[PDB]
Amino acid sequence: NSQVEQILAEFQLQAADLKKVMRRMQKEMDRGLRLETHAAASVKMLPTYVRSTPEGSEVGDFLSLDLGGTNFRVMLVKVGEGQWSVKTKHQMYSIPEDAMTGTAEMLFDYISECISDFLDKHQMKHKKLPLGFTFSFPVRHEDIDKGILLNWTKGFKASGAEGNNVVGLLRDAIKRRGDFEMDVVAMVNDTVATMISCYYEDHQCEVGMIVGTGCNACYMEEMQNVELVEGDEGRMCVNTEWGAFGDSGELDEFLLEYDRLVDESSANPGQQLYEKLIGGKYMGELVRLVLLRLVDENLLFHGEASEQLRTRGAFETRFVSQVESDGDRKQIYNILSTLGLRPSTTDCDIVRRACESVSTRAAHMCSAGLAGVINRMRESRSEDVMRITVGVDGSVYKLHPSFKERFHASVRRLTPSCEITFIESEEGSGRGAALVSAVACKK
Ligand SMILES: Cc1ccc(NC(=O)[C@H](COC(C)C)Oc2ncnc3c2cnn3-c2ncccc2Cl)nc1
Ligand SMILES: OC[C@H]1O[C@H](O)[C@H](O)[C@@H](O)[C@@H]1O
Ligand code: NA
Numbered sequence: 238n239s240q241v242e243q244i245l246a247e248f249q250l251q252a253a254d255l256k257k258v259m260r261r262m263q264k265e266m267d268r269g270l271r272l273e274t275h276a277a278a279s280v281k282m283l284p285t286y287v288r289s290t291p292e293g294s295e296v297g298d299f300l301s302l303d304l305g306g307t308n309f310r311v312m313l314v315k316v317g318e319g320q321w322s323v324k325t326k327h328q329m330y331s332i333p334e335d336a337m338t339g340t341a342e343m344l345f346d347y348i349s350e351c352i353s354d355f356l357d358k359h360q361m362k363h364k365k366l367p368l369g370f371t372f373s374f375p376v377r378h379e380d381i382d383k384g385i386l387l388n389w390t391k392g393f394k395a396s397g398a399e400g401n402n403v404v405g406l407l408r409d410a411i412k413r414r415g416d417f418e419m420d421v422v423a424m425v426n427d428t429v430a431t432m433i434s435c436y437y438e439d440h441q442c443e444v445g446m447i448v449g450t451g452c453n454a455c456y457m458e459e460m461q462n463v464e465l466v467e468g469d470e471g472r473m474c475v476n477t478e479w480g481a482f483g484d485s486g487e488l489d490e491f492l493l494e495y496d497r498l499v500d501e502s503s504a505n506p507g508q509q510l511y512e513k514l515i516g517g518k519y520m521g522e523l524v525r526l527v528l529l530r531l532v533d534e535n536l537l538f539h540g541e542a543s544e545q546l547r548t549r550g551a552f553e554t555r556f557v558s559q560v561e562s563d564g565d566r567k568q569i570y571n572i573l574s575t576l577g578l579r580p581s582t583t584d585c586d587i588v589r590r591a592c593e594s595v596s597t598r599a600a601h602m603c604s605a606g607l608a609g610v611i612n613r614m615r616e617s618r619s620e621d622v623m624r625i626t627v628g629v630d631g632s633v634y635k636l637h638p639s640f641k642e643r644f645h646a647s648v649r650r651l652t653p654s655c656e657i658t659f660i661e662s663e664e665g666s667g668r669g670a671a672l673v674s675a676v677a678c679k680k
Contacts, residue, residue, distance in 0.1 A: 238583075240534070240536060241531060241536050241537075241587055241590070242590075244527075244530060244531065244534070244536075245527075245590055245591065245594045247493055248493070248594040248595065248597070248598045249598075250491070250598060250601050250602070252650070254491065255601060255602075255604065255605045255608075255647070255651060256605075256651065258488070258491070258602065258605040258606075258609075259605040259606075259608045259609045259612070259651055260609070261482075261487050262280070262479065262482055262487075262605065262606055262609035262610075263609045263612065263613050265278060265279055265280035265482055265485075265487060266280050266282055266477065266609065266610070266613060267613075268280065269281050269282030269477070270282045270458070270462055270463060270464060270465075270475070271464055272464045272465065275464075275465060277485075279481050279482055279483065279484040279485040279487065280477055280478065280479055280481060280482050281375065281387075281476075281477070281478040281481065282458075282475050282476075282477055282478075283375065283376065283377060283378065283475065283476040283477075283478060284378060284463055284465050284466045284473055284475060284476075285378055285425060285426065285429050285455065285473065285474040285475065285476050286378050286380055286381040286466075286473065287381070287425065287429055287433065287473065287474040287673060288471055288472065288473050288474075289457060289471045289472040289473075290471075290676065292440070293321075293676075293679065294316055294672060294675030294676045294678070294679055295316065295367075295675045295676075295678040295679045296316055296317055296318055297315070297316065297366075297367075297675070297678075298313060298314070298315050298316075298364075298366055299313075299314045299315075299316065299366060299367050299368070299369060299671040299672075299674050299675050300312065300313060300314070300352075300366050300367070300368040300369070300419060300671065301313075301314055301368070301369050301370075301371065301667045301668065301669075301670040301671040301674075302348065302352065302368065302369075302370045302371065302407075302670070303371040303373075303427070303430070303666050303667040303670065304348065304370075304371070304372055304373065305371065305372070305373025305374075305391075305427050305449070305450070305451075305666065306373075306391065306449070306450050307331060307332050307337070308329060308330070308331050308332070309329070309330050309331075309332060309348070309351075310327055310328070310329055310330070310664075310666075310667050311327065311328050311330065311351060311352055311355040312325055312326065312327045312664070312667045312668065312670075312671060313325065313326045313327075313355075313359055313361070314668055314671030314672070314675075316671075316672070316675050321437075323437065323668070323672070325664065325667075325668055325671075326359060327664065327667065328351075328354070328355050328358065330351040330354075332344070332347060333347075337393055337394065337395060338394045338395065339395060339396070340395060340396050340397045341395045341396065341397040341398035341401070341406050342397065342406075342409075342410065342413075343395070344395040344398070345406050345407055345409070345410030346410050346413065346414065348407070348410060349407075349410040349411050349413070349414045349416075350414070352411070352417065352419070353414065353416050353417060356417055362416070362417050365417075365418040365419060365420065366419055366420070367419070367420050367422045367674045367675070367677075367678050368419040368420065368421050368422065368674065369421075369422065369423040369424070369425070369430075369669075369670030369671050369672075369673050369674030369677075370403075370404070370407060370421060370423065370424040370425070370670060371424075371425055371426070371427050371430045371666050371667060371669065371670040372384075372403055372424050372425070372426070373391075373426060373427040373447075373451070373453075373666070374386060374387075374388070374389055374390050374391075374393065375387040375388060375390060375476075375478050375481075376403060376424070376426065376476075378424075381422070381423050381424075381673070381677050382404055382421060382422055382423055382424060382677070383402060383404055383424075384402065384403055384404060384424050385400060385401065385402055385403070386398050386399050386400065386401060386403050387399070388505070388508070389504075389505075390451060390480065390505065390508075390509055390512070391450050391451045391516070391518050392503075392504040392505075392518065393504075394504065403424060404421055404424050407421055408421055422674045422677045422678060423670065423673045423674045423677045425669065425670055425673055426453070426455060426476045427445075427447050427449075427453070427630065427666040428445040428446060428447050428453050428454055428455035428476060428477075429445055429455045429474050429476060429669065429673075430445070430665060430666050430667070430668070430669030430670045430673065431445040431446070431447065431628040431629070431630045431662045431665040431666050431669055432444060432445025432455055432456075432474065432628045432665075432669070433445075433665075433669035433670075433672050433673050434628065434662055434664075434665030434666075434668040434669035434672060435626065435627075435628025435660045435662060435665055435669075436628075437672055438660065439626045439658070439660060441624060441625055441626040441658070442625075442626035442627065442628050442660060443456055443457040443472075443614070443625060443626070444456040444457075444607070444610060444611065444614075444625065444626075444627045444628070445627070445628045445629075445630075445665075446607060446627060446628070446629045446630075446631075447629070447630055447631040447634075447666070448515065448516070448517075448599075448603060448629065448631040448633040448634040448640070448644075449516065449517055449630065449631030449632050449633060449634070450516055450517045450518045450631075450632070451480060451509070451512050451516045451518060452479070452480055452511070452512045452515040452516045452603060452606075452631075452633075453476070453477065453478060453479060453480050453512070454477050454479055454606065454607060454610055455474050455475060455476045455477060456474070456475060456477070456610050456614060457472040457473070457474055457475075457614075458472060458473060458474075458475045458617075459471075459472055459617055460472060460473055462617070463475060477610070479511060479512075479606050480509045480511055480512030480516075481508060481509055481510075481511065481512075482510070482511040482606070483510035483511045484507065484508055484509070484510055484511075488510055488511060488514075491514075491602075492510070494530075495523050495526040495527055495530070496510070496513065496514065496523070498526055499513050499519050499522055499523055499526070500513055502549060503519070511602070511606070514598065514599060514602045515599040515602055515603050515633070516633065517554040517631070517632055517633045518554075520554045520557055520595055520596060520599055520633065521550070521552045521553045521554035521555075521556055521557050522549065522550060522552060523595045524552050524556075524557055524591055524592055524595045525546065525549075525550075525551065525552035527591045527594065527595065528542075528546060528552070528588065528591055529542060529546065529547070531587065531591070532546075536587075537584060537587055537588075538578060538579075538580065538581075538584055542578075543576055543577035543578050544577060545576050545577050546576055546577070546578065551576065552576070554632075554633065555636075556572045556575075557592045557595065557596055557637070558633075558636050558637045558638060558640075559571075559572050560572055560588060560589050560592045561589065561592050561593065561596060561637070561638045561639055562638045563589060566582065566585040566586075569585040569588060569589055570585060573585065573588065593639075596637060596639070596640050596643070597643055599633070599640065600640050600641075600643035600644040600647060601643070601644075601647050603644055604644050604647035604648040604651060605647075605651060607627070607648055608648055608651035608652050611623070611625060611627075611648075611652050611655055611657065612651075612652060612654075612655070615652075615654060615655055620654075620655075621654070622654055622655060622656060623654070623655045623656070624655070624656050624657075624658075625655060625656075625657055625658070626657075626658045626659075626660055627657060627658070627659050627660065628660050628662050628665055629659055629660065629661055629662065630661075630662040630664075630665050630666045634661075635661060645659065
């Protein structure tokens with residue numbers, strides 16, 4: 238146990254580590270905003286064309302598509318005035334591997350089939366509506382309804398997409414199918430969508446964050462600081478793409494053996510390193526690799542590992558969450574037996590410690606990110622204590638039994654001059670795309 242706890246201790250980050258990360262994130266943000274350094278910035282600070290504007294939208298029905306993982310969502314969002322009301326209906330769709338690792342057209346054809354299914358099941362296929370698209374990958378926006386995919390993240394691979402107008406890809410697929418018509422009026426990031434949906438509930442919400450399969454944030458920047466887009470008046474949402482923080486070496490002093498290994502076998506070696514420390518795509522696999530380290534030292538399972546624990550990806554991140562949901566070891570035993578293992582009573586405690594060590598580092602790394610954003614915003618204003626609302630969506634955050642609590646407390650220590658309200662978005666990644674579309678249509 239002695240030696241377990243010092244192998245596990247490599248995952249600790251001191252206050253001083255977290256402040257260093259925070260400040261470096263603030264300097265990368267700043268690099269990404271300036272024309273002189275934008276092109277070489279690891280933290281891209283992408284203009285979204287979502288602006289501060291008087292409250293209100295068109296009234297009516299709006300479709301939303303939300304693509305950001307293997308599971309995706311179609312939504313019908315009805316905006317009405319009394320005063321305002323928003324009601325939603327959704328369906329979920331799972332994308333087969335074939336459709337994610339083939340061509341862009343195969344991917345967008347599958348998407349359009351699903352839209353078709355949604356419209357059938359809501360007896361509205363004869364209707365032509367405005368559609369907002371939540372598309373959760375790095376995009377260079379040229380307008381609210383136009384954007385070029387820079388690169389796939391989170392293991393997506395469809396060919397023929399990178400470098401192309403993602404909105405064009407959707408619209409072409411819709412037309413190929415010829416079974417329905419929609420006006421694609423807006424495409425946004427999931428961070429952005431989450432923030433808009435949250436703003437609707439709370440006007441102080443000016444940051445969106447995702448801690449899901451990937452990890453990213455967006456926030457409202459002053460237009461004079463957004464040098465890529467002409468104008469000094471008002472604010473525009475910037476999609477930080479903070480996932481790529483570290484991709485210029487900024488994190489090198491913190492990366493562990495397990496981190497290099499996750500990166501090397503990932504779909505995108507050398508990219509999204511910050512996100513690899515945090516996102517649900519990778520947390521379960523980090524844990525897996527730590528559990529193997531403790532085995533090949535004969536500190537775990539008497540040094541015998543199962544077939545499935547030697548198998549990349551078999552420690553799914555939902556396991557990490559379930560482990561930590563356990564004190565009778567029932568939750569831990571039920572995940573471990575699943576894996577072809579026979580834990581002692583001590584192993585169960587060891588696996589729960591390992592989960593904790595990875596999941597805690599994630600919450601801590603993530604808090605430094607968000608603190609960076611929130612402190613920068615405070616500094617750009619007339620704030621003694623800044624009260625701000627953050628919209629947060631993602632499965633790590635919503636479902637991980639203690640990640641959230643750990644994240645909040647770490648965030649608060651790094652932001653001792655702000656009071657932060659975190660709003661857990663029920664379906665903001667999807668609803669927000671509809672609401673942005675409604676605002677866009679009001680033109
Ligand atoms: C092209 C375009 C479209 C939209 C926007 N801006 C917005 O959608 C703004 C962004 O504001 C940030 C600070 C979050 O958000 C909104 N701008 C205007 N009205 C809005 C909202 C959000 N809800 N909401 C709203 N409020 C009341 C009823 C219905 C709605 Cl949709 N900018 C450009
Ligand atoms: O889904 C959360 C995030 O995952 C990845 O970081 C994507 O690059 C990013 O665009 C998205 O916001
Ligand atoms: Na500007």
